Design a protein around this ligand. Structure first.
Ligand SMILES: O=C1[C@@H](P(=O)(O)O)C[C@H](O)N1O
Ligand SMILES: O=C1[C@@H](P(=O)(O)O)C[C@H](O)N1O
Ligand SMILES: [Mg+2]
Ligand SMILES: [Mg+2]
Ligand SMILES: [Mg+2]
Ligand SMILES: [Mg+2]
Lengths: 433, 433
């Protein structure tokens, strides 16, 4: 089945090395690449880096590449398994690695091969990638997702004082996915004009995901800007707001520091309950319909308490790290009601699909997501359609490691033709469509 | 030969619509997309936009898409021409349009099809794209180019006061193209730390091409910054500097305004002679080996004078717009000694290859180039290798519409194996290899 597997080091969207894998079958070349996070949860499967400080500041991935070329590849070719057998090939890699967190080969090594196998498998089935993924997941009724565009940035890697990481727009009232793209781009260009006028001509360069990071401190002010741009573009009822707080990043001694990029001062810290009250005010004052990582990745009681007292979507990211073990705990404690799905948090296509089905079985939403460090790879566009989740976040409508996914979703919608359905206001629960 | 052509609107790396074309033959699907400039020369072929303010603020390209789908596609199909016949298919489109600047269909309509045809032709020849391009151009040897990374930004679309558009680094002393990527990436990341420390944490977000635009006014300070990053990264011996001044953008009244982003004040203006004197100082104080568009696209006398008084590379971009007619004039007046090759400035692959050959036959260097607005398309990576020009500028090593090209060049290098030659110090004049 598999003629050759060959891995190489390429550069991701931030200029850092990452893994790319070529898989050859009689049907051709199938290529995939691995993303890389910046604000990673402490429970993520292992991203294997070389640590050679004289090459790429220690960020090379030659070791992961070698694990693929020297060990994984001959093992999978020796097995004789068909590339359609995703689960068997993935399980084979998992047992070969033999560690829970994939720390022998690296999650980035195993995922690279896993993605390529999946693409080669689709071609063997003579199916577009999204339909093959749907079949692997047991789905038949595909849907185009609502895109969630990160347009204002704060948090650990933004050069402002804004503590919360992401402020997103979601065109839930769009007519189609192609129309959602147009709405997103128009609000984005509107927002750029607003920021230029108010914060100056030098305030509209972009961050890693293509959004803006103007110098503000109040999170409420970020929500004000976004709502202002939505209204100015004429889409007040059609576009709503999502947030990724990434609260693990400013968790201090059991409390939360909404000014953590300023010199340390413990008296400013607030409690989980105070943080929960602040969110309730956001949901009251602004059309916020989704909040991701509202509390620290270990602060389970605060998650459960908040989720039980709000009607919006509550997304586990660093809390759940696409990990069935952590998800089951979150399900049992009712910590959240949506899973953020990051294939490189867990390290294989099979396990990511299992994590998605576990969420969906329990009435949760699922939002497919990029990493801050992306590539020209568009796998997650087919993934979100095949898993039928109804929602994807994969950047502002700016920088092609983000537009490559959005463009692919527009091609998919086009291909599905008259059968294309758009999640719209049912992005949390698209199965009712 | 051509079974079907289908065009669609996608978004480019700036979030604006552009043309993508799917072309089908017996051997499969061949896809290409068109870039879009920000500081466009007045002599470029016409980029056709819709101007419908109800959509994308008038930036849609539905008309171009419709010209392809309704007019160009059935014409090329009815012609029965093989996809290997690049020249004939391109000429067919040129005649169909019947205007000098492709203003009936739009240059973007025509190029999109032209690029897809070229990819379909390579597969028909059972060749990698760059070898097909090599044959179309009459070349036999292939060479990997020195990359020119735009790391510091000024000019029309930078939010600082810096007038000159691009300050680039060229790893002429790298061992190979893969090593050139590493040198570029390490200097880029070094520079980011330098900019952070001197100008602040809020000063390292990126512009359209992945580079930085800190708040500086003196162009000499830009050159100092770059030099400082090169040495701190430890590569003083191996990396030199290129500039794209884009002087057309600040040509005022026959004079030049090095503060054109401040409110108009003619007392500020300097003459071409004075500008030329400033370049002479740059070339002396810094390792500047290449200057692009030093004078206005119509200021021929200033070009000829300057070029005759220096030994560095002098690059026509807006001067020449990849246009054989304007190049012949430049040749005659010895206005410059290098052509910046932008396929969408002239609108077809055949005409771009002709522009390149006309340049090379007259002893000029050729630097293949991106546009500010790019896509996930990687055609120019194969183009620069097939045309053997020895140099390419396709962005900072940041943002995957940039890295897609650089990554593709690393794959090409790998594929050529033992036969891979890197232009290195012969980037201006590679045919001696
Ligand atoms: O937490 C994050 C960061 P990361 O780089 O994936 O950690 C960006 C992404 O949108 N998300 O949810
Ligand atoms: O003048 C330019 C700009 P443009 O967007 O192509 O006009 C960016 C490119 O590097 N170049 O030479
Ligand atoms: Mg994170
Ligand atoms: Mg997150
Ligand atoms: Mg220009
Ligand atoms: Mg230029």
């Amino acid at each position: 089945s598999i003629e050759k597997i060959w891995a190489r080091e390429i550069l991701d969207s931030r200029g850092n090395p990452t893994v790319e894998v070529d898989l050859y079958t009689a049907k051709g070349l199938f290529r995939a690449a691995v993303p890389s996070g910046a604000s990673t949860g402490i429970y993520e499967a292992l991203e294997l880096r070389d640590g050679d400080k004289q090459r790429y500041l220690g960020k090379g991935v030659l070791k992961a590449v070698d694990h693929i070329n020297s060990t994984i590849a001959p093992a999978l070719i020796s097995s004789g398994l068909s590339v359609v057998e995703q689960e068997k090939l993935d399980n084979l890699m998992l047992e070969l690695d033999g560690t829970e967190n994939k720390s022998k080969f690296g999650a980035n090594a195993i995922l690279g091969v896993s993605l390529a196998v999946c693409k080669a498998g689709a071609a063997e089935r003579e199916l577009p990638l999204y339909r093959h993924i749907a079949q692997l997941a047991g789905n038949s009724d595909l849907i185009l997702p609502v895109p969630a565009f990160n347009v204002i940035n704060g948090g650990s890697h933004a050069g402002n004082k804004l503590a919360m990481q992401e402020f997103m727009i979601l065109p839930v009232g769009a007519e189609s996915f192609r129309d959602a793209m147009r709405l997103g781009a128009e609000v984005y260009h509107t927002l750029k004009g607003v920021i230029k006028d108010k914060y100056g001509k030098d305030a509209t360069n972009v961050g890693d995901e293509g959004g803006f990071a103007p110098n503000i401190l109040e999170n409420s002010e970020a929500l004000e800007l976004v709502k202002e741009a939505i209204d100015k573009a004429g889409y007040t009822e059609k576009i709503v707001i999502g947030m990724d707080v990434a609260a693990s990043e400013f968790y201090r001694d059991g409390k939360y520091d909404l000014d953590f990029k300023s010199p340390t001062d413990p008296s400013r810290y607030i409690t989980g309950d105070q943080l929960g009250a602040l969110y309730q005010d956001f949901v009251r004052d602004y059309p916020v319909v989704s909040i991701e990582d509202p509390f620290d990745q270990d602060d389970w009681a605060a998650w459960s308490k908040f989720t039980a007292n709000v009607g919006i979507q509550i997304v586990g990211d660093d809390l759940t790290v696409t990990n069935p073990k952590r998800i089951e705990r979150a399900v049992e404690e009712k910590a959240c009601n949506c899973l953020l799905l990051k294939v490189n948090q867990i390290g294989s296509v099979t396990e990511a699909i299992q994590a998605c089905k576990l969420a969906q079985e329990n009435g949760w939403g699922v939002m497919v997501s990029h990493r801050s460090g992306e590539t020209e790879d568009t796998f997650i566009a087919d993934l979100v359609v095949g898993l039928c989740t109804g929602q994807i976040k994969t950047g502002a409508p700016c920088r092609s490691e983000r537009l490559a996914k959005y463009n692919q979703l527009m091609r998919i919608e086009e291909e599905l033709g008259d059968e294309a359905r758009f999640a719209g206001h049912n992005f949390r629960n698209p199965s009712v469509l």
